[model samples]
Target chain A: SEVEFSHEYWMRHALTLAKRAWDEREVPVGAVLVHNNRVIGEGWNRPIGRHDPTAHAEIMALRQGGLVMQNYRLIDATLYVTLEPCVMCAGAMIHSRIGRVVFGARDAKTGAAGSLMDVLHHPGMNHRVEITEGILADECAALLSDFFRMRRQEIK
Target chain B: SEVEFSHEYWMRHALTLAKRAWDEREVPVGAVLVHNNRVIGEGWNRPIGRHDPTAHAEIMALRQGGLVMQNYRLIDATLYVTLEPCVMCAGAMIHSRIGRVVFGARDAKTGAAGSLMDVLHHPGMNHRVEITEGILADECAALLSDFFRMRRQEIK
Candidate 1:
């Protein structure tokens, strides 16, 4: 049997939401949480103001999806984030009991990018969660470049 | 009626979460979402790596609270953040239809602080949202100083 939807589809939606964050001078990272073919929650990088940052895409979606008591478990949901989640978000997923994670780009420099991988292999970590990387690497790369450019401008 | 929790109580929780992000070398920020004493979601600052940043406290809570379909409209929820939310998170609260925002420290340097005030007065924004400030101010100030120290160390 064929899958009903692909990672590319969700990643594209995440990219669309990233643009919304970028318009607000944010990093433009976007994320969406899906369960049974429906988008449960979504978010993008949103700096509260000049400094007060907001939740990352993954955290935002997770928070949104966890609104309901029953929905907090995330037993079989799939998370689609523009870039790989940081260590904090990975920890959040572990606590939320998420089922799987799929990200576009990998964090090469920071040890944070491989957080999901680390979680899966941890001695006492949840073994049921699945992980996938690089669904739309090129697009995420371009988005990251844009984020760096914006950040440099802010710093200067 | 006497409320069971005070601003200091939630702010303390925010501070605890902020340490999580700080351990990851991120700016120590923490946020919690609540509705009538029940916690909805929480988050802290998490930079993806050296350059890639993640969610701020306010946004994390907002995203989490907005996850359940019923929770999407936050007319009765309150947001408690360690520091004042930046412009981005303020905008998010406006869009999420939040009821109120409570924060500790005020960011003087960046234009991000006082964003909730700005939002409340915005011409067509959600004027119904209430805003509060200065809950455990000194603690947040010290937390911020710690953040700056760590940041400086990272730069060196």
Candidate 2:
């Protein structure tokens, strides 16, 4: 009766939107997402209250969101998010077979940095990629710039 | 500046508080903490976020508070968060010695449980062992009740 989108769609679109914003704003060391007009998740090089091997915030948000989505079996919904969902996150979306991926930005550091896109592409989500040039680039860059500046001082 | 309390003061307090709670609860499946009311730096478990690995919500909350008390350290401070401070989370805290921990809850289901307590005990954090009773008693019993109820339904 109605169209149904997949988890991949949400993950992909979120990545595109977030990564671009992150790059332009120099938002380093963490990930963010805007879901359903609400920022539902974040990832960082470190966990806030505790340690998480999967310290990535976007991944964590996807996971918590996925649990609810999968548990309820939600389908046929449009999503706006940031950053490319990681392989683990993509794996979660494999079940949904999403429709579109509206990316806000792209990660500048390629190779390992670009691996997330490569992984999604292998699954052929490129055709579904929808670039938005970035919604939160400035914020991401500002936060990252400050974070890295402090981190660099530490490393020295 | 102000007479800054050692990071360990707040951290240990959080852990001590949690231990007292756990002893009272007897579920040995929850967490407690000593904190300064920050969103991060909270503690009360080992391996944060894992199932019954010697930490719970209480510890997380307390640890968050302790971090705030320690001035967020931006980098330096030691905390004695209860329950081994979750492995990965421990690493994050360790950079500032905010990772110091005391174990109270031990997962009965797995040997991985109580190990945090053993680890803490061995490290000479002896006084850190506050009575894990009082608040923990009812807390533990309530959780046990819920667990058993779910288990019964599962069995049926």
Candidate 3:
């Protein structure tokens, strides 16, 4: 028999999920991750801030979570997360043998370099970002609009 | 009766509550405000990094709800906020004519330098911060301990 868990099952146990995110440092603005519909890791940017644009925070969080997951032996599991993983880390996910990678939001402004999309398109990458447009629109319309503005400006 | 609201209530809402505490800043920290065993408002600090410590967040959320009461001309309502208002702003609560206060956690490590407490206890001014030790002990004990450790290590 196959086991199915509702989103409520995940959300009700969100404290554990949030703890994993905190320990993984993935819940920061730049990062958050869920596995099997449960957030298993997250991250944030360095407090002093970074001068090098390469030190993008969201990427750091994904890498950190990867490190954490590597320590755990698992098979046929999926990674659910917020924000797209950086292009540089895409190969790392492939190397790790991650079956699938999912995200909540996409980079509407930054990372317009098409690097992330390219990674998702890469054969056997098996990645996606669940754009909860309704939820994002209703709950974070203003912030999303701000993000869109930032994305367009950063692209320029 | 003439409606009156104090600067404390205004700042609590506009400066402290909506902007500082409730809006994804230190978002992991769960907080609640109660008056007469009824919830005025409740929220958890979202995972925001690069937050300013001087601008304490719990006070911000508490102040926002407080402002709503202030607007109703119920200047005398007591607040059962989940965390202590920082020492910097306790006097504001006093000046706001707040009658009684209940809180979930105490800054035992960062005890108000007796300054804000002194102001509230001044002649004809009585302000209270009821630490819901039982509730905090059950729900946020780990964070409560983390807060104490974080405070004790600070040179300030």
Candidate 4:
């Protein structure tokens, strides 16, 4: 059976990318930038591997999207992530002029799209990004919840 | 005459790079990342030329600095820029763990170091960045002042 590339379809792809982050020992997060149903950019957390703190899943995907599209403005694209973005990532979305963002889960701690603070749609900011939250949220929150819980157990 | 590589010395270098931006018809801003008296990364504004809004001088230098240092955490480096950083670049600095920042002029519009806001040292953030503003205020301000004046004349 073939699945139409809807938001759910893209999120499933993001989930696979998040698995790569776990294997890399980074956070279990992933992101993709889609334009007209084509995946123009994709990334999982890579700060630990790339040695660059800006290399979060969303930031990484944005960087690649900029390079792939040959433009920093992804004004026509939608970003799909396995988790909510942080302030740094949210700030990037504004600068990149992202058209929309759809994510799973909420980052109550540092989430900038909504859970913690909303920088993406701040009235004062230059660009506004549309948000759609909780796409496969339970599944998205499960990976991080399980990963951190396992890590805490090892502390003993 | 051997000039000591002080903040003033680096700011002079940044000024030269800013000239490149003017020549390229982009914003006249520039930056460099220095660690232990060595310049690891340098850039001038290129968002207009590169079609990437994130290609501001500070952001460009930080990206190159991350790659050059082979790490994202630049915990002992100083970034010198011809102008104060915007929120996006300031956010990147926080994520990158920049040791310090020395800038020549205040943005007054979107400056995040001190002119408008101070995200670099907001107590709630994960990292803290040191700020030293107005390193070469007159010189730095002049380039932008002149460029904009010229542009305004052309608008007619």
Which ranges in model 4 have alpha carbons more than 4 Å from their true place? A1-3, A150-156, B1-3, B151-156
lDDT of 2 by residue, B1-156 (tens): 223344333433454544444444423233333334333444332222232222343334444544455442233223333333332233223322333333333333221114322222223221222222122234334444654565566674
Question: Model 1 — TM-score against the truth?
Answer: 0.49
lDDT score at residue B84, model 3, on the 0-100 scale: 50
Chain A TM-score of candidate 4 vs. true chain A: 0.95
lDDT of each: 0.69, 0.36, 0.37, 0.85
Q: Report the lDDT tens digits of candidate 3 across residue range A19-114.
A: 343344333233344555544444443322322112233334344444555532213334443344443233234333445544434544322114
**Relative to the unseen true structure, what is the C-alpha lDDT of residue B63 in candidate 3, on a scale of 0 to 100?**
44
Best by lDDT: 4
Model 2, position A8, has a per-residue lDDT of 43
Model 3 lDDT tens row, B3-112: 22332332233223333333342422444444453445444443223221212333333445555454321244454433454333343344334455544445443223
TM-score of each: 0.49, 0.35, 0.31, 0.88
Which pairs of residues clash in candidate 4, taking residues 3 or more apart in a chain or in different chains? A51-B72, A52-B72
Q: Pick the candidate with the highest DockQ.
A: 4
- The per-residue C-alpha lDDT of model 4 at residue B125 equals 78
List, for all models, the DockQ compared with the true complex: 0.03, 0.03, 0.01, 0.48
Classified by CAPRI criteria, candidate 2 counts as: incorrect
Candidate 1 local lDDT, B63-138, one digit each (tens): 6776642444666788888877654466566556677888888875322334323434344442456778888889
Task: Quote the positional error of residue A47 for candidate 3 in Å.
Answer: 33
Q: Report model 3's TM-score to 2 decimal places.
A: 0.31
Give the better candidate number (1 or 4) by lDDT: 4
Model 3 residue B99 distance off true place after TM-score fit, in angstroms? 2.7
Q: Locate the minimum summed-lDDT window of 10 residues in model 1 chain B.
A: B110-119
Q: List candidate 2 stretches off by more than 4 Å.
A: A1-56, A59-156, B1-28, B35-55, B70-99, B108-156
